[PDB]
Write a protein that binds this ligand. Structure first.
Ligand SMILES: O=C(N[C@H](c1ccccc1)[C@H]1CCCCN1)c1cccc(C(F)(F)F)c1Cl
Ligand SMILES: [Cl-]
Ligand code: NA
Ligand code: NA
Length: 546
């Protein structure tokens, strides 16, 4: 009755843009483009986005908006399959715990960059070794030694915690305080903040791109980026890497979209917004690639090498590679400040949803007016429980546990959840009723291109992603470190804490549904319950209730 709505469509579009666009469009996409084809990777990138990225986004947005419920209350089409919803909250917990620990290396670097001389420029600090060979000395760069010997003192084993790094506990406190203070009212509070932490990164990117373009030696760094190698598109690996990147980057099956769309009005165009956001998210990765590769080309020119020795994948690029290249520009503590501010803003627009997704559930599932008057207390209850649970990741052996949670927990549990949820709404509920349900909202039948892509093509692409992820599984390794057996076992058990919630809840539900034959018990608890439909009595007309 008092759930509330957004108020402006611009708020919803900006919030979704800031939630989908995260840190995966800055360090992941450029390296993939450089490695897998060059300028010929965009053909598999933009062909597997039309047939796999837009249909899934549209289906999730239309599913969330119809029944004005979060990621846990929309499963009234088949109450037995509610284990999928509980699978969307476990994974969103993991991505809500280790994401704030990445915010130290953006906050700590930002706070340590307010100096007239960058601390990682010259190799004369007492924490250095004999291999300080760099470029700015008046092979080991003096940004890697700072990264692994002063910011975090890396140990020699995953189970070798030595002490908690207090400067990192400081960021975690500050960051959780900011996250809680920015969600003090929810929709009426975050909706007015996304006007800032969704657009400033574009200004920062434009400034950095201009500086890179006018910089000498940059045109040789953009040629390697987008020169076509058409041979690569003839392989199956390139078509298997352009399907996983689209699926993961769009933010599919973490919840969020189903809980953002739950606040929209009933008669809202879910087709225009499903295309605008999808195109905007995929049009930022190219710009980020340009920005990164211009300065990388300048760096390679300065050290007089081909651009193959100065390319890094993840945290080794944003903290070991890019900062080591910004130190050659005239006014470095300003470009570094802007870059780390952009990283902080990019990583902070996603954490808002990962806290509001878990609050909306716990609020609506219980069901009361007492749980609505004290939503801020609930929001504080989850923030202080994500700070105590993220302390072990700030110790000496923090990087080891950081990479084991992003490669096992939220790696293939997401693909399984989406595949099952596709089957649940298409062939169990019925693909002939969902089309009429969507037509009731949009006002026109879905385009024919979307009916053939929702029943045959997209599930096939999901199956292809699932199969390709199994044939190309290798044990996780960090640099030359080899993870022991117990770490792999812990990671596998972590990955089994989300996809194992579907069979258990199904058994629990069918162990209490009154029936005679198991086929009849399966027949029940799989039909829409008598609460499926619009939440307002003014919209219920025709097929759904008198
Ligand atoms: O950004 C990262 N993964 C993203 C992701 C998205 C969704 C879920 C999980 C992970 C990628 C996955 C692949 C497709 C594009 N998005 C990443 C990479 C290396 C190290 C780290 C660290 F160290 F911070 F954990 C991270 Cl967080
Ligand atoms: Cl991407
Ligand atoms: Na983001
Ligand atoms: Na992302």
């Amino acid at each position: 009755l008092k759930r509330g709505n957004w108020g402006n469509q611009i708020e919803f579009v900006l919030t979704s843009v800031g939630y989908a666009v995260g840190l995966g469009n800055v360090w992941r996409f450029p390296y993939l483009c450089y490695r897998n084809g060059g300028g010929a990777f965009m053909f598999p990138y933009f062909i597997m986005l039309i047939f796999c990225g837009i249909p899934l986004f549209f289906m999730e947005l239309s599913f969330g908006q119809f029944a004005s419920q979060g990621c846990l209350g929309v499963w009234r089409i088949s109450p037995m399959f509610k284990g999928v919803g509980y699978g969307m909250m476990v994974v969103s917990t993991y991505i809500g715990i280790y994401y704030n620990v990445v915010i130290c290396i953006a906050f700590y670097y930002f706070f340590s960059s307010m100096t007239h001389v960058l601390p990682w420029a010259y190799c004369n600090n007492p924490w250095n070794t004999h291999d300080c060979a760099g470029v700015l000395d008046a092979r080991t760069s003096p940004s890697e030694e700072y990264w692994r010997l002063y910011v975090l003192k890396l140990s020699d084993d995953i189970g070798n915690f030595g002490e908690v790094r207090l400067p990192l506990l400081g960021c975690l406190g500050v960051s959780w305080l900011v996250v809680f203070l920015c969600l003090i009212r929810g929709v009426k509070s975050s909706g007015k903040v996304v006007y800032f932490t969704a657009t400033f990164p574009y200004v920062v990117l434009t400034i950095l791109f201009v500086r890179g373009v006018t910089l000498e030696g940059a045109f040789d760094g953009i040629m390697y980026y987008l020169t076509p190698q058409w041979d690569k598109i003839l392989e199956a690996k390139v078509w298997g890497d352009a399907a996983s990147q689209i699926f993961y980057s769009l933010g599919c099956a973490w919840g969020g979209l189903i809980t953002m769309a739950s606040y929209n009005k009933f008669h809202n165009n879910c087709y225009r917004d499903s295309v605008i956001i999808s195109i905007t998210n995929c049009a930022t990765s190219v710009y980020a690639g340009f920005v990164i590769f211009s300065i990388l080309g300048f760096m390679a020119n300065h050290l007089g090498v081909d651009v193959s020795r100065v390319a890094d994948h993840g945290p080794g690029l944003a903290f070991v590679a890019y900062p080591e290249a910004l130190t050659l520009l005239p006014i470095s503590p300003l470009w570094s400040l802007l870059f780390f501010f952009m990283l902080i803003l990019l990583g902070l627009g996603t954490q808002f949803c990962l806290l509001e997704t878990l609050v909306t559930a716990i609020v609506d599932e219980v069901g009361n007016e007492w749980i609505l008057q004290k939503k801020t207390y609930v929001t504080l209850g989850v923030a202080v429980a994500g700070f105590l649970l993220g302390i072990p990741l700030t110790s000496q052996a923090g990087i080891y546990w950081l990479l084991l949670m992003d490669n096992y927990a939220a790696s293939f549990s997401l693909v399984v959840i989406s595949c099952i949820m596709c089957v649940a709404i298409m062939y169990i509920y019925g693909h002939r009723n969902y089309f009429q349900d969507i037509q009731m909202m949009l006002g026109f039948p879905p385009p024919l291109f979307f009916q053939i892509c929702w029943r045959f093509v997209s599930p096939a692409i999901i199956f292809f992603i699932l199969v390709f992820t199994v044939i190309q599984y290798q044990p996780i390794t960090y640099n030359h470190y080899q993870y022991p057996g117990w770490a792999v076992a812990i990671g596998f058990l972590m990955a089994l804490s989300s996809v194992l919630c579907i069979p258990l809840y199904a058994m629990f539900r069918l162990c209490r549904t009154d029936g005679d034959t198991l086929l009849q018990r399966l027949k029940n608890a799989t039909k829409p319950s008598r609460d499926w439909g619009p939440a307002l009595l003014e919209h219920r007309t025709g097929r759904y209730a008198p």
